[PDB]
Amino acid sequence: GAMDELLRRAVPPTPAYELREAEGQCADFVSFYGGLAETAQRAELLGRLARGFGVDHGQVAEQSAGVLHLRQQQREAAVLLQAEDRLRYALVPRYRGLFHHISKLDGGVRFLVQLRADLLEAQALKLVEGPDVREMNGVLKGMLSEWFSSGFLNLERVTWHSPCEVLQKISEAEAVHPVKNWMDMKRRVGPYRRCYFFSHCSTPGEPLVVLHVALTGDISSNIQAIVKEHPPSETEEKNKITAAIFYSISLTQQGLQGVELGTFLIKRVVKELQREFPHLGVFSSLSPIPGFTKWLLGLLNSQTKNELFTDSECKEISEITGGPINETLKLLLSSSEWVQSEKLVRALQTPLMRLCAWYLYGEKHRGYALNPVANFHLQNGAVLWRINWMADVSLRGITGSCGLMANYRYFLEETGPNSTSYLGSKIIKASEQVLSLVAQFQKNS
Amino acid sequence: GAMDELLRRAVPPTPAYELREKTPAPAEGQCADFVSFYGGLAETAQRAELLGRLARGFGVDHGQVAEQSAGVLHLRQQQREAAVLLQAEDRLRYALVPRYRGLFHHISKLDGGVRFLVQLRADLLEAQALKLVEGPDVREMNGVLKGMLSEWFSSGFLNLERVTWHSPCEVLQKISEAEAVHPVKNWMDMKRRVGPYRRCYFFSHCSTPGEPLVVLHVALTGDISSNIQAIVKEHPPSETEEKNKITAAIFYSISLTQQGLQGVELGTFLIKRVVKELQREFPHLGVFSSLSPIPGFTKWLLGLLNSNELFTDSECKEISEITGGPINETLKLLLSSSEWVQSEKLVRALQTPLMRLCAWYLYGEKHRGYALNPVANFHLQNGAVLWRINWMADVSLRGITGSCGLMANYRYFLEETGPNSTSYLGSKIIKASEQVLSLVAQFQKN
Amino acid sequence: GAMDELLRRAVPPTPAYELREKTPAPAEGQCADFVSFYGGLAETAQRAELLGRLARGFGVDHGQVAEQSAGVLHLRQQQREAAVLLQAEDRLRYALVPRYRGLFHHISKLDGGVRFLVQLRADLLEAQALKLVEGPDVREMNGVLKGMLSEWFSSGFLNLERVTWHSPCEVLQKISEAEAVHPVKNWMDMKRRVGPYRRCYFFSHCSTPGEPLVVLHVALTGDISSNIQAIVKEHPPSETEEKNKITAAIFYSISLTQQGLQGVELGTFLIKRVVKELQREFPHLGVFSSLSPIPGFTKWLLGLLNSQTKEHGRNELFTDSECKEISEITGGPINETLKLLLSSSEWVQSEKLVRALQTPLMRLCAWYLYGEKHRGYALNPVANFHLQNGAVLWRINWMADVSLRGITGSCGLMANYRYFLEETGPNSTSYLGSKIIKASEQVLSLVAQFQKNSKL
Amino acid sequence: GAMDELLRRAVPPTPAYELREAEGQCADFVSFYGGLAETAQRAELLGRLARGFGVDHGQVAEQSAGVLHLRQQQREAAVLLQAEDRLRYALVPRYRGLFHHISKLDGGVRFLVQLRADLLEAQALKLVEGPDVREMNGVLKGMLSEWFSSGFLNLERVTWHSPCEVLQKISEAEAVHPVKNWMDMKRRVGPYRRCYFFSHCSTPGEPLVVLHVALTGDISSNIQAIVKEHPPSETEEKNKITAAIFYSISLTQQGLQGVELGTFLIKRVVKELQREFPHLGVFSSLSPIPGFTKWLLGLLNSELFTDSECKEISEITGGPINETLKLLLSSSEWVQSEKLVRALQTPLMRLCAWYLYGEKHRGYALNPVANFHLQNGAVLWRINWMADVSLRGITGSCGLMANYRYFLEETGPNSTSYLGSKIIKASEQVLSLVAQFQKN
Numbered sequence A: 001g002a003m004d005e006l007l008r009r010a011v012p013p014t015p016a017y018e019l020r021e022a023e024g025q026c027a028d029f030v031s032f033y034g035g036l037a038e039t040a041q042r043a044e045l046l047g048r049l050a051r052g053f054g055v056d057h058g059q060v061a062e063q064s065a066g067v068l069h070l071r072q073q074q075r076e077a078a079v080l081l082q083a084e085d086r087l088r089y090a091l092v093p094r095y096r097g098l099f100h101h102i103s104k105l106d107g108g109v110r111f112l113v114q115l116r117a118d119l120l121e122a123q124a125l126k127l128v129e130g131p132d133v134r135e136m137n138g139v140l141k142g143m144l145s146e147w148f149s150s151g152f153l154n155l156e157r158v159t160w161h162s163p164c165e166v167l168q169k170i171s172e173a174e175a176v177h178p179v180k181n182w183m184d185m186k187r188r189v190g191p192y193r194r195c196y197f198f199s200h201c202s203t204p205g206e207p208l209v210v211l212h213v214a215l216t217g218d219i220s221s222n223i224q225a226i227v228k229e230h231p232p233s234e235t236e237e238k239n240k241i242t243a244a245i246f247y248s249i250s251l252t253q254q255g256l257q258g259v260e261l262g263t264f265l266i267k268r269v270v271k272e273l274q275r276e277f278p279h280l281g282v283f284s285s286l287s288p289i290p291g292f293t294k295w296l297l298g299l300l301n302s303q304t305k306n307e308l309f310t311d312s313e314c315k316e317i318s319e320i321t322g323g324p325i326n327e328t329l330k331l332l333l334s335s336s337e338w339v340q341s342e343k344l345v346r347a348l349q350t351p352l353m354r355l356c357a358w359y360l361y362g363e364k365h366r367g368y369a370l371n372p373v374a375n376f377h378l379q380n381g382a383v384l385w386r387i388n389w390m391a392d393v394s395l396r397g398i399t400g401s402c403g404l405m406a407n408y409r410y411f412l413e414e415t416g417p418n419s420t421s422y423l424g425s426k427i428i429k430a431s432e433q434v435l436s437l438v439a440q441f442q443k444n445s
Numbered sequence B: 001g002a003m004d005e006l007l008r009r010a011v012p013p014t015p016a017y018e019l020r021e022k023t024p025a026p027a028e029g030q031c032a033d034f035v036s037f038y039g040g041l042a043e044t045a046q047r048a049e050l051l052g053r054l055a056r057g058f059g060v061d062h063g064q065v066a067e068q069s070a071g072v073l074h075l076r077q078q079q080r081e082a083a084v085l086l087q088a089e090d091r092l093r094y095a096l097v098p099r100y101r102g103l104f105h106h107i108s109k110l111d112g113g114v115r116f117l118v119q120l121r122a123d124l125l126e127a128q129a130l131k132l133v134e135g136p137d138v139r140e141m142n143g144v145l146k147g148m149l150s151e152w153f154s155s156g157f158l159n160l161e162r163v164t165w166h167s168p169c170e171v172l173q174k175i176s177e178a179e180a181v182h183p184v185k186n187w188m189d190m191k192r193r194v195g196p197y198r199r200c201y202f203f204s205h206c207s208t209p210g211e212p213l214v215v216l217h218v219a220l221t222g223d224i225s226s227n228i229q230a231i232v233k234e235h236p237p238s239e240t241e242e243k244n245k246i247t248a249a250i251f252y253s254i255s256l257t258q259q260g261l262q263g264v265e266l267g268t269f270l271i272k273r274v275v276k277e278l279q280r281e282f283p284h285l286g287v288f289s290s291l292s293p294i295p296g297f298t299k300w301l302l303g304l305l306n307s308n309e310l311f312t313d314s315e316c317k318e319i320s321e322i323t324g325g326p327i328n329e330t331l332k333l334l335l336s337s338s339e340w341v342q343s344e345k346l347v348r349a350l351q352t353p354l355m356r357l358c359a360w361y362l363y364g365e366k367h368r369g370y371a372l373n374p375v376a377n378f379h380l381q382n383g384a385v386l387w388r389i390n391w392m393a394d395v396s397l398r399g400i401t402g403s404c405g406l407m408a409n410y411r412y413f414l415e416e417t418g419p420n421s422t423s424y425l426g427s428k429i430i431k432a433s434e435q436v437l438s439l440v441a442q443f444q445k446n
Numbered sequence C: 001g002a003m004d005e006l007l008r009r010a011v012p013p014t015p016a017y018e019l020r021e022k023t024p025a026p027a028e029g030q031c032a033d034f035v036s037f038y039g040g041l042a043e044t045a046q047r048a049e050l051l052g053r054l055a056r057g058f059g060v061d062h063g064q065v066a067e068q069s070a071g072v073l074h075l076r077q078q079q080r081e082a083a084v085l086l087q088a089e090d091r092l093r094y095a096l097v098p099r100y101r102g103l104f105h106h107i108s109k110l111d112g113g114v115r116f117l118v119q120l121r122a123d124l125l126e127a128q129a130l131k132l133v134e135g136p137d138v139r140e141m142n143g144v145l146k147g148m149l150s151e152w153f154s155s156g157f158l159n160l161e162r163v164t165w166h167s168p169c170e171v172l173q174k175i176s177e178a179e180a181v182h183p184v185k186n187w188m189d190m191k192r193r194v195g196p197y198r199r200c201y202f203f204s205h206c207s208t209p210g211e212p213l214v215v216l217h218v219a220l221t222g223d224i225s226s227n228i229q230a231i232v233k234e235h236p237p238s239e240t241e242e243k244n245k246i247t248a249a250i251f252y253s254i255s256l257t258q259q260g261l262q263g264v265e266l267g268t269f270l271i272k273r274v275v276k277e278l279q280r281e282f283p284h285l286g287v288f289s290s291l292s293p294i295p296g297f298t299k300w301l302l303g304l305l306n307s308q309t310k311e312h313g314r315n316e317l318f319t320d321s322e323c324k325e326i327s328e329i330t331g332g333p334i335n336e337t338l339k340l341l342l343s344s345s346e347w348v349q350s351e352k353l354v355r356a357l358q359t360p361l362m363r364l365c366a367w368y369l370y371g372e373k374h375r376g377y378a379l380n381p382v383a384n385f386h387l388q389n390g391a392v393l394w395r396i397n398w399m400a401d402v403s404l405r406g407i408t409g410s411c412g413l414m415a416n417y418r419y420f421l422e423e424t425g426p427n428s429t430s431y432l433g434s435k436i437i438k439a440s441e442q443v444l445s446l447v448a449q450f451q452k453n454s455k456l
Numbered sequence D: 001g002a003m004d005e006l007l008r009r010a011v012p013p014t015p016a017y018e019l020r021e022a023e024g025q026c027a028d029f030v031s032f033y034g035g036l037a038e039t040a041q042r043a044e045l046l047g048r049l050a051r052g053f054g055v056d057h058g059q060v061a062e063q064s065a066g067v068l069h070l071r072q073q074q075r076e077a078a079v080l081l082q083a084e085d086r087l088r089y090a091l092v093p094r095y096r097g098l099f100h101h102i103s104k105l106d107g108g109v110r111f112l113v114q115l116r117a118d119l120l121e122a123q124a125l126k127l128v129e130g131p132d133v134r135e136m137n138g139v140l141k142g143m144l145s146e147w148f149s150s151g152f153l154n155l156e157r158v159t160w161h162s163p164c165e166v167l168q169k170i171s172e173a174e175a176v177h178p179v180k181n182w183m184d185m186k187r188r189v190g191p192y193r194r195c196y197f198f199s200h201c202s203t204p205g206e207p208l209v210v211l212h213v214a215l216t217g218d219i220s221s222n223i224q225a226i227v228k229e230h231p232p233s234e235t236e237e238k239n240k241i242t243a244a245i246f247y248s249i250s251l252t253q254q255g256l257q258g259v260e261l262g263t264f265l266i267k268r269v270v271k272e273l274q275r276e277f278p279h280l281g282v283f284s285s286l287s288p289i290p291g292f293t294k295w296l297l298g299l300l301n302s303e304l305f306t307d308s309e310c311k312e313i314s315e316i317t318g319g320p321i322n323e324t325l326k327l328l329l330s331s332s333e334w335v336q337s338e339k340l341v342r343a344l345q346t347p348l349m350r351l352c353a354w355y356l357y358g359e360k361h362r363g364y365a366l367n368p369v370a371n372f373h374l375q376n377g378a379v380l381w382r383i384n385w386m387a388d389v390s391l392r393g394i395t396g397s398c399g400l401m402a403n404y405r406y407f408l409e410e411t412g413p414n415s416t417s418y419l420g421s422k423i424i425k426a427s428e429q430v431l432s433l434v435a436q437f438q439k440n
């Protein structure tokens, strides 16, 4: 009814072609979109926009034919090149014109970053579907990747000398591990810790992406050991800083996904630590495995009459849970109770670790590694270096991935080709420990 | 010879399509090599040839395009799902993006890249203006670079810095040097231009703050100014600005500092941003206009004075009675001399027709239907009204020569700037004052 | 004991007189040695003895004084030229400046000197308040140090820094720690105190900017506030300060950070400077007052509730009708009754009792501020401070502070010291020179009520 | 009529004694003093204030007697000490009360710094005389030395990145050598040059005292060599910076004289240069000799010249010695007559050596610039012939510039010896010229 009437007067028409080289129309769109409360409403609006205001498939098809018409006679660089530009133009979707103008308005880029986050949330919630939303997504992503391309991001460091607004924002959008009080946030940014972020050169002190670093002795195999420490406060001694551990890495603005913000922050933070500590050569993460429990629980099925446990392993389990294997585990593995029963913990060490190794290494989504965190560190050329048993005993941790945390190591002089091998050939570089667990798993499935 | 070699190992290769949203690792290295090399090239002619080599060899892949075009066509003959058609359309759109965009994009991320890219554009515009590189390929490459530079130098990427006497000397020296409309006389003068009743601003890129890109000088006044000398040659009583006696704001000088950014931006945001900026200090300030020169006027007159009507018989009889000679040999001489101004008798008689002639030159004379005069175009683009033509407005040697001492008033009406811009850009329409329209109507006689 | 030694090689020697306006070279070294040593002394009693040693041995040269006095006298017997008389007078004036002034002056120039000297004063005041150092010499030395410190902490030597949420955490932690009137509850609270409708300022020495000396908290309001809880326990709608709804400015906390600077300054500039500062942002803002506590009140009441008992149940502080009432509420005598429940902070629970205790307590408090004196200068320190600055003892507030701290210290009473921008100068003179207090009709009324029925 | 009427209602009376521990009266004084245009008017006002509002010589005499009355019976530390404080009080002049209060008002200390400069100028111009102005001077000086002691001054460095307001102020109150254009001021603060100043910690970027430094190869013997150079601009190479030469040292605020602002600027500037250039151990000034011409001319009234020297002079000037030289030595013409220059080399240099070394004002060294560097423990190290050819230079000190050297490990005792014992440390070159002069 309404919704459509706005779209038609807000989205400018596609200029003929010539006159391609609507200011007071944009404010009409932003004003309206802001006026909608429910996400469901923003979904229908973005959905209808994406549908009715894409390319003109007719003209695209016409200009395409016009290019082939010209390659049969091969005439001048000049006239062939215009036939190509006419096609390039027909391919420019109609909503791109709307975004392009909005961006050149006041609260412009801020609004578009926001809008995309609204679209990303509606996509994952299955409120918007089809291929017209997937296109609009990429268009916004492309536009955002040019305004937020590394060269325009300042690397800022967080300390206790930083503004309170910054510490609050860093703890608030902290999308990994909660902080318990101010008493703690002082420790988190204090000695033996590094908290770096990225801000746009336009808007400083406004964090886009946030990274947390633990300056340590060896590669950490536990998160509680970092979060719940009382780092001496005997000012950093360089002698005992041998490993840089990445423990929290989160986006503050969901609108900026797939813009490689994360990747560059790690890259830039390394060159920083390298400058400060010239005798530091061990760079690794202590990352979670989100979706592992959901994968395992899901797999505890069924009519694929899928064996994930040896004879010896199954008998031991059931003589600790009072019933069959599949129904008992399905119940308690989603309720975090199983941890206080130490017989069931020691029992579940070897198989879980082995299935976990497989979950990261063997399981694929388009051949890239289902686990999005795994894809992230591997894209960057990291090595799936070590799997750590009961490394995260916290509620989200236990029910999220049965307490399992993974170590993704960064070997500086081999990140570049590891990125290529991973992206080009779909290869995962894994340590002898991980390959052994994958080897164990190969004995049964 | 070797120029060719660098290009083939420096211009990053077009990635697969699936790996299109992900930067490959060697991109950082490959770019620095290009920057290193282009930097190493001293004489421009080499830079010009290399740019030619780039536009030719590293544009759109013509084979992949024709293929994907048949792709989209072969699918529309068998009405396939939108799911499929969009996919085939997208690969064609990606296949249409030229290879040099990757080079430019990957150079932007570098330690001094955006600066470098600006300097590169400057060379490409020079290489063209010196017929050193002709061709649609260089033309294609120019437009792609401009577009990229347009997003990196858009309002929201620029700071509005103010110059005062509290500003460092380094800064004042930069503004004096980059001064393009009316050169600064002495230091005692520079102090006046940033003092009481005068505001001086510049826009800097957020990434390189302090390095100016555009200098705007503003005169705070009681009316719409009509004489340039009346601004620069005024020493006020130094008494801190009487806020009450400020009716309007006049823009008397606008300088683009970097030739690399020629008409990438729009212009409006240079103005309307300085306006809000001023308004904060002077809430009740509501009148805004420029006091612009008319470069290209005197030349356009002399160019035409080769035959034509232009003057009345009564004016023809008069000029000659003042001078002593014919008219079409007379005017020709004293106009292309800057000496005619000395005879007040002559200054007065020349007034009516020159004003009339000028009024046509701005409003009637077009270049692809977009106003022949560059200054006019600029203000017209932004939505300014061709408000008033001024007689003996600039009596400096530079003014008399370039535009027979005439200066136009481009008046910005905060409220009507949007529609006025549309009218001018879309429909090629000029909003002009009654004072201007009157003179055009007078010209329309002969 | 080796204390003596350091003093004789650390306190710079009095220069000639001709070389009086020129610093000698070893002065820098000699001072650093004194700072080094005094710093090295851990237990206070040592610092107290060393200060005693200094005041005694390094004051005025009593020999040189008596000599120059005879000098000025021996010349006035023979009416010599002004040229000569002034010269002899000046040497006597110089001969009267004690030796420890040179020490203090030469320490001031040092890398951390003024800070050090403040801390030194704090010790000298402590050493006196603990009868650790008695005598006119320490009294002389105290007065000389105060005077020196008065010129270094004089408005024009202080910065006015503002605390907001953009300020560093280091700064917010310093303000939380140095909080002296109403302790800050939690961090979510600290954000509120420097947020919309609240201003937080401090004065720092120009030389050490960022190191605060005095924290002023301000509540931007629609009227003159009367309840402390109504300030701190308010969460506004966060909507950027509606400029229009701000009638007045209230000072709810004032904290002196360094005990070394106790009453060297005046106070006037602390207020009036924050005032001009505020006024710039809110031109049409014209009402100013503090919402101060009354520390030392409840104790003063209980103190009298002992020595000021009387015959057949009644006493000097209450009426018979009030005496009959309180006891009817409680169940017991009165002068044993009040004594107990007042020194408990539990009386507040009975609304019956809260109401009856009102009229007399307000009356008693009004005397305590306006009638009760200490060397004729108002017994209450907070009162003195605001009175000094030229503030009017504007209004006494009932159940103003219902916190456990408030009820204990001053039975939930809080006074309003109102600053009238215009009359601050005369009001200050009146208070300082003539020991006069400008008070509201609301206050004067209550004093007159106290006078009608209390010989004390 | 007025003047006196104001003073009486503005200057508060001296409180009895007890009540010693008038805010709206001060503004009445500052408002009025500002209202006066002529310096001549400010002189009469400061003169009358100084006269009628000093000490009460009566009470001073009375309290003095009361101290001697107490030492005949020697009673308690307590009661003797009060008799001393009562005397200390009577000695406090009445105008000190006015200044003390003014200082605690807004544009306070700024106003007092200004007022003293008005008094210093009126004193030197002989508008105000007597001993009551000399006392008021010292009072103001004492009050100023406590608000301006080293501890409260920030050391600021001037470069081309500095505000225009700063460069202008540095060139404007440049009280030694004029700068010709902006083109020059860039060079003056540019490479191989150091321009440092002092600002109060209250008012930053507001210069009180200004010092100029030339980063050089050896101790400079000419000012034109520094002022009129074109320092390479090939950014500083540390290898060729062996000597730090102080060439301009001037006060911007005349109100702050004798407050040792100068000394502490050098002391602090040294510790800075020492930090930046650890291989730098040669510190010296290239200072003028103001008042030398005036001394010499004065002395030609009416033998400072040997037989051989007099005959040579007169056979170059057309008349007697005293009247001829008196005329041309004050007109800077004598420089373009090279016969008269070479003639006047040896005697001038010798008389000049004496002027700095031998001539004394209270035994300290008449030349105030000489007293300055010597107070600091500097050595009168070298006299330089025709080192300042500029107009002020020639007519000021017949082109003579002197080198005051700073030997770092012996400045401390040289300061003591100079101040305590009135000794001047001079190099063998200077002692030789003094020796030459001793034959006269």
Ligand SMILES: CC(C)(COP(=O)(O)OP(=O)(O)O)[C@@H](O)C(=O)NCCC(N)=O
Pocket: A176, A246, A247, A248, A249, A250, A251, A256, A257, A258, A259, A260, A261, A262, A263, A285, A286, A287, A288, A372, A373, A376, A377
């Ligand atoms: C880094 C995160 C926040 C997203 O980064 P993003 O900027 O979207 O990466 P990219 O896809 O843009 O390259 C996320 O995907 C992730 O990997 N989070 C946890 C990683 C960890 N804790 O080690």
Ligand SMILES: CC(C)(COP(=O)(O)OP(=O)(O)O)[C@@H](O)C(=O)NCCC(N)=O
Pocket: D176, D209, D246, D247, D248, D249, D250, D251, D256, D257, D258, D259, D260, D261, D262, D263, D285, D286, D287, D288, D368, D369, D372, D373
């Ligand atoms: C430095 C001058 C300007 C006065 O300084 P001042 O602040 O009075 O020194 P002080 O007596 O306060 O220590 C002056 O006495 C002087 O020495 N001038 C020239 C010195 C030089 N050019 O090297």
